[PDB]
Structure formats: C-alpha cells, structure tokens
C-alpha cells in the first residue's frame, strides 16, 4: 500500500521560510495569518461584506463547463450562487501533458483545503483552478522533461509561433503534437497501462484546439470527479465580467505603480529579494491586437502601446474597456487583483515563487480597496518509488539528505574510497620526484646553451602530462569497475532531485500514470495530506 | 712551390701488398721480379727473341695520330721501328673529362718509367697509353663526381644507350654533353683559369664523335708534349693487326680456360681473392654484330652466341676472324695477352685491381707462349691543397692518418669532448631513476586492474622517449654551436678520402686545373716521382 510520511525541510528562499515560520514581520507583507485557527472564520466574515456577481459568474462557468460533461463540476459551480459560499483558488500555466508535477500537487492542495474548510466552516467551499490562459509565454508550456543518458532533457513540441498569442488562443498542430506525445511516451517502459493512457491523452488532444483546451481536458479527466472548477483567464467569455476591474486598475493606475515600487523597496530593505520586473512606465495591463498581446505603457498621464503607435487618454481607454473588454488582460501584478475581484476567495494556494511575489503586492491590494486573501502554501511532495527507496538504503543515503541536496557529493565520496590510498600518495610523490630529477638534467643541458630553456621546460611539462594521463586512465578504470553502484547514485538523484531541482519542478505526471496506472492516481489523490508545512513523501 | 713527399702506406689488399713487398711466393703469380735492378736488361734480352710487326704498327699509329697534329707523338711512334726499342704500357677506360685522377697518375707513371729506362738502358723506350675503347661498360665512364652538401655525388651524362656498343663506337650527344660540362664546372669556384679551360674542353668535345675521341683529345692536350702514344683497343683500324692473336686465342681456347680456372683455384688456395668472373663456357672473346657487343661462348667444341643463335666450328671461326677481324674484341682475360702480342713491352703499369687479376693470368700467358711482362705498380698520389694542410694541422690530425682512414672517427671524438661530462652521467641516471619511480606508480595502478599493464608500460616508454628527445636536442645544439670546426673535419675528408676512398679514385683533374691552372699541371707532371712503392704526396 501507498504510504504518506512527512519531513521538515527548509525552503532555500528565506522569505518563504519566514512566512512559513510565522515571523512577526510578515504582517508587512500579508493581510491574514495562517498561523491562527480562527482566521478562516474571520476571512468569511470579511467576505460577507463584499459584493460579487455570483449568478453571472456561475452562469458563465456553467456554460464553459458544458464541454466537459461533468455533473460533479456543475454541482460545484451551483454552490457559487449561495451567498455564503467561498472558494479555494490556485493556478498555473497550461503545460503540455499538465506540465510539471507541482501542477497536480497544487490541484490536490486546492481540493483538500476546500473539503477541510467546507467541513469545519459549514458553508460550501468550492475548489477552483485558475488556468493562466491569458499568458503568452508558450516556451514555459511547450515541452516536458524526458529522461535520457545524461539526465533530464527538455523535449519541445516542434511548432513555431509567429504571433505572440495567449495560450488560450494558440492552436496546437494536431499531427506534430500527436507525434510529440508518441516521442514522450517512447521513452517510457511499456506497461499494461500504456495503451489505454496513450489513447486517453490522444483523445483529449483531438478534442482540443488550443494549449488551454488540451490542458483542461486532461485535468478534467484526472479531477472532474472531485468537482474541480476551471477558470481560464484567457477565455474571451470571462472578459465581460472583468470590465469594471480593468476600469478600476485604470483609474487607480498611478497609485498601483507606486504601491508596487514602494513595496519592492521595503522588501529589499527588510533583507529580501523582489522578483517582479515592472517599473513606473507600466500600466500592468496587456492589450490584444490581431491575435497578439502588447504591453500597455504610460506616457505623461496617457496610455500607450509603443510598438503600434497607439495611445489613449484615460477617458478614451475607459470607454474602450467597456466596449471591448475582450482585448484586455492582466500581468503578474494585476492577475491577483482580478482573481480577488472575481472570486469570493477563502484562500489562495501558492507555490514558493508566488509567496515571494505576493509579498510584493500587499500595497497593490490596498490601492484596489481590499485585503490580500490568505496565502496558503501548496503541498510540496516527493514521490518515492520502491526501487528508489531500496537504492537509498543500499547506498547509505538518508531520504531527507537526497531530497535536500541530491546524491552527487555522496557519489564522489564513494568513488574516492575506491581509489587505493597508496595510489594517490605515490602518484603525488612521483610527479614531484620526477620533476626534481628532470630539473637536474635541465641544469646540465642549460650549460650547453641558455636558449634551450623553453624546449627543456616543454619537455618537463610533456612528462607531467603523461603522469596526469596515467592518473586519468586509472580513474576511468575505477569508474568502469564500479559503474553499477555509481549509476545507482545517479538514478536516485534523477528521480528525487533531477538537475538538483525538486522532483515536482522537473518531472510530469505521465511517467507515473504509465508506470503505476489509474489506481495509483486514485489512491494518491485521496491520501490524508495535511497543511502543517512539512514536505510530503508519498511512498509507493 | 709545389713539394713532393712520401708516406709508407699499406694496401688493404693483402695480395697487392705482398707483391709490393717482394714475397717469395709471388713467382707463382708473376714472371719478372721488380725487386732486382738487373731485371730490366733481362726483359730486353727476352724481347729481342720475339717477332713484332713494328713497321705495320708504327704506320697504323702514325696514321691514327695524324688527327692530333703532334710532332712529339709522331717522333715517339717513329722509335717503334727501331728493333731495339720497347714500351712502357698502361691503360684505362675512356672516362669523361679523363675520368678519375688515377688515370692522370697512371699516365705520369708510364711517362716517368719510360724516360728513366730509356736513360738507363740506352735504347728507345716509348710511353704508350692503352685506351680501353673496346669496352662496352659506359656506366663506368659516363659521369664524374661533383662535390655537393652531403659529399661526393655522381653526375651522370644525360644520354641513354639502346645498343650495348663499345666506347670507341658510342657517339656523344653534343648538346647534352656540353650542358653536362657546364653543370660540372658550375660546381667549381670561378677563377681566372675557368674560361680558358672550359673553352679548351668544349673545343675538344666539338672535335669528337665518340667517348674515346673526346678522352684522347683531352689527354693529347695534357700530354702530347711528352710524346705519349695512344692505342685505342676499340679502333677498327687496329683489328687487322690483331688477327693472328685472335686466331691463337681460338686455337688454344680450351687450354686458356683451364689456365684461368687453375690459377684462380691456386690463388684461392694461397689465401687470396680472385676477381675475374669467367667460367669454362667462356671463349674470352666478344663479337660485334650491328654495333653491339656479344659474348662468345663454348658448346661442345664449337663457338656460339646464344642470344643471336649463331655458332661456328673452330675452323669456320678461324676463317671468319681472317675475313672480319674488326668484329672481334678482347675481354679482361685476353686483353693482356693481346697487349703483349702487339707491343714490345718493357713494363706494364698496373693499379691494385690489375695487380690482383694479372696474378690470375700467369698460366694464361704461358698457354700463349710468352712470359707475363713485368708489372710495375703505378704511382699512388694524394694532392694536398694548402687550405687542407692547414686544417689537418688545426684539427690535430696526422696526414698519414687522414690518407689511411679519413677524419670521421676524429670528428666523433671531438664532438664528444664538447658534451659536458656531467650531462651524460646525469642523463643516464635520470632515465634509470625516472623508470624506477614510474614502476612504483605502475605497481599501485595495477592493484586497480591488471589489464592496465600495457597502457602503463606505454606511458613509461613515452616518458623515456621524451628523455631521449631531450638528449637528441642537446646534441643537435652542440652540433650547431661547433659547426665551423666540425665542417673542417668533413672538408679534409672530402678532399683526401672522399667516401672513405682514395682521392685518386673519386675525384678528377678538372677541379685542379680550374683552381690552380696550367702552370700547376706542368709542374705536377715534372715532379721527381720515384718508384719505391711509397704513397706520393704532392703539396701545393
Ligand atoms: N520521465 C520520468 N519522470 C520521472 N521520473 C523518471 C522518469 N524517467 C525516469 N525516472 C526515474 O529516474 C530513475 C532513473 O532513470 P533512468 O536513468 O532514465 O533509467 P533507469 O533507471 O531505468 O536506468 C528511474 O528509475 C525512475 O525512478
Ligand atoms: N670537385 C672536386 N674535386 C676534388 N676536390 C674537391 C672538389 N670539390 C671540393 N673539393 C675539395 O674538398 C673540400 C671541401 O669541399 P666542399 O665541402 O665542397 O666545399 P668548401 O670547402 O668549399 O666549403 C674543398 O675545399 C676542396 O679541397
């Protein structure tokens, strides 16, 4: 049976660790403390004073979700009409094949938190996944890692984009994407699960047009049972509902840019590293023209797009937003403000990057007139396959050590212990003694002609090169002799900390579905995860 | 002034040395002793019982020599009609430009001996040079040595021969031979003598048709004053006079071949090395057909030419000799017998090869019914140029040592004395100590994997190669540093014992005429040489 364990592992980002630890200084960066049990009721009471267009949102969502044919999704959306309901929201880009595992872990986080709070608070709490379909960074979503001879390599979908178009409006080349899927799967070991899985994934592709369509369909197959609601930020249909918040962003635009710059300075001053790159020429909105996305920038009280020589006064842009809301979209700064406008948010589920940059946005929320919602760290998970757990034990490596720093230093220690002790010492001594002997010869030779010196020093270096080559040869032979053990260090790392990054950032769910099957995933989803800020280890 | 000195130098051929020393056993190999003063009168008395066709020979020679326009040659030939006269004879091949210096030394020997005996005996004694014009070995005569960067090199006349024709009947390509002469002279330093000499040599060429014509003309220019008589064995004109001796060779042919084979065995048995290659199938005559020369061989009492499918009975060949004597010619074995038939010979002047092979012919002479004439060693000469004598002194080499063995061993000793003593010892020690150190490393490496051994032994040998290359480099630098001295050892050898052979075998008179002029040659000819069997050194 599958087992859940925990480990206490520090985040390498000191801001995120301080947040997780509940430092007093975090009230300068966040509006709700996740460290007191009664915060959730307080959050609900704060939400009861806000106005949402719940019927309109629910009708849009209902209409959007008719493509999935899921009574569970529809029953979730129906709960949004109850004025006491709220949602747990988190989001990701629309990675091909669902992208990195942290996308799955995030969705699990949303669903688990929403269920736990529905039970504790006794109001409906809906799990919403925010598909970042407005985003035009297709290089972030157009590949998965595959495992090759030297380790993980990006396998990119072979399709180029002329237009800088959003994920939600970029079409997939059906034939190229099907071939790519075959190429990803061809790297796996074939199992009893392979054909059915590959058929299901290809079915989802042929029912898609865009990157977001395909992502949604896979996610619905995986989670519709749990009643997960999908909100695609790049769907033209949602834009009408966003009009007044685009207009609010416009009206408070100068105050917003000030709020970002001041918070970022404060963060830098407190000892931390802001990551949002958005100066005071930025309106923090994008405009779509001819299927492409352009930055809106500021020029002495006006709004401009420099690449298209377009501009607007504030009043002209306000009217333009009313008439054509579908042309507008948010950036990193404004997306969270739009989320909070649209959705009655009990909690936002955040990864470590998002925790850092949400701390940059505290004053931004205030400029828009509402609190930052509570920010709950998503679950951080490592899947420990049984053959990897066996190898950790065989190589005398502690699980926590592997998760924190991989296996490279351990491997290097093992290899060195295979070099006989007396080799190193005699090799060191030989280099030095041979050079001393050679020097005595050069001393005699030089009495013939001082102009020999360069040639004599070349000769000495050539001999030392031979000795180095000898040493390199003996090391290569040890590498060969010990190759089966040494490869096990590499296998452990490849699984747990590929490229010295966390498993959940590098790998993807398809490997695991292919190897372990649907019953694995069902069990995995339903494990008793908890939000105590501990690293979760799922032992297969 | 030019000075004559002597040195006592042993011949490397023990037979020739024993002859020169007057060993008792030499009466098995020769008919007259050159070691008793009264032999010359005895020889004259033996000749007074022989019949020669002196008027016929003198008329032929007179007619032949009209091309030279020399009253001195003609006055010499006139002496042959005196029934008391005799000749000193010696011979050589018709080398281009007069061939090796020993050709000049031989002619000097003939002229000096003839003059000395004319004075002592008070009968006319004529100097005759036997031009070996019948010989078809053009590769022996179609070049001279020239001095190039690595020492003496043969410079061959660029002309090929289809026909295996005699020197006396082979035409020179006028244009190719003039070019070749220019190329030989171009290697000399130009002097005040050059143009006149080159003009004289080219004049002789344009007055020649054949190899023998050119040789004779040069020799006449050099010696006609002394009344040297030229007998060209390959002139058709002389053949009629030879008829009866061709016929005698025929009649006694079986006895001749037996005489050669028995003497050769005896010589081998006495401890010496016969050099004539002529078995019992050999008639020891050649036949000329269509300008080419063919061996006459024997086949069960008949005479055959195998290559032309021609044969004769003895009686048929006898008649053929009478009708066509011009078609016949002698080989190494029969030439001396023909010489003795034709010319009343007081003495034969011989080089060291000829002394050896004349010893093979003692019984051959007897089969023909006459004694072998006295064999006088020709003068062996070294010309010592003043700059070479200076260099011998500077390099601490004794003249005799240089003449006996060149300068190579001395040069090698000088060079070694320039290698510091402590270099050799430290280089030797280093090779050994480095290999001992490297071995200790290989001993440690091999504990990893025994299959490394070849690679480890390769590594060790590569290092030892570096040390050898170091040593070779230091030696090359010493060679450069000492290059002016070392080159002087080489210069001395190049002059005195080029290619470790005697000067007189390798070099040629033109270099000396070009450098030193006609006055040099006049003086050289007239030096007081003596026949005491000592090496003659002519100091310029
Ligand atoms: N695509 C993948 N996603 C996640 N983990 C992987 C993937 N491929 C391999 N692994 C893990 O990494 C380990 C080492 O993989 P690898 O070196 O490719 O091959 P193997 O272990 O089969 O020789 C695997 O045993 C597995 O646990
Ligand atoms: N063609 C030659 N015949 C005879 N002796 C020669 C000839 N050429 C050179 N020599 C002799 O050999 C010596 C060495 O000659 P070589 O090395 O050619 O040139 P050099 O001495 O002029 O540098 C000369 O100095 C001379 O005494």
UniProtKB/Swiss-Prot annotation, chains A, B:
| Quaternary structure (record) | Homodimer in solution.
Q: What is its EC number?
A: 6.-.-.-
Consequences of knocking out this gene: Mutant accumulates GlcN-Mal and does not produce BSH.
Family assignment from sequence similarity: Belongs to the BshC family.
Coiled coil, from the record:
456-476
Q: What does this protein do?
A: Involved in bacillithiol (BSH) biosynthesis. May catalyze the last step of the pathway, the addition of cysteine to glucosamine malate (GlcN-Mal) to generate BSH.
| Protein name per Swiss-Prot or TrEMBL | Putative cysteine ligase BshC
Which residues constitute the signal peptide according to the record? none
Summarize where ADP binds, as residue positions.
147, 385-387, 491-494, 507, 511
> Which Gene Ontology molecular function entries are recorded, alphabetically?
ligase activity
List the keywords (alphabetical): Coiled coil, Ligase
Q: What class of enzyme is it?
A: ligase
What Pfam families does the database record attribute to this sequence? CC_BshC, Rossmann-like_BshC
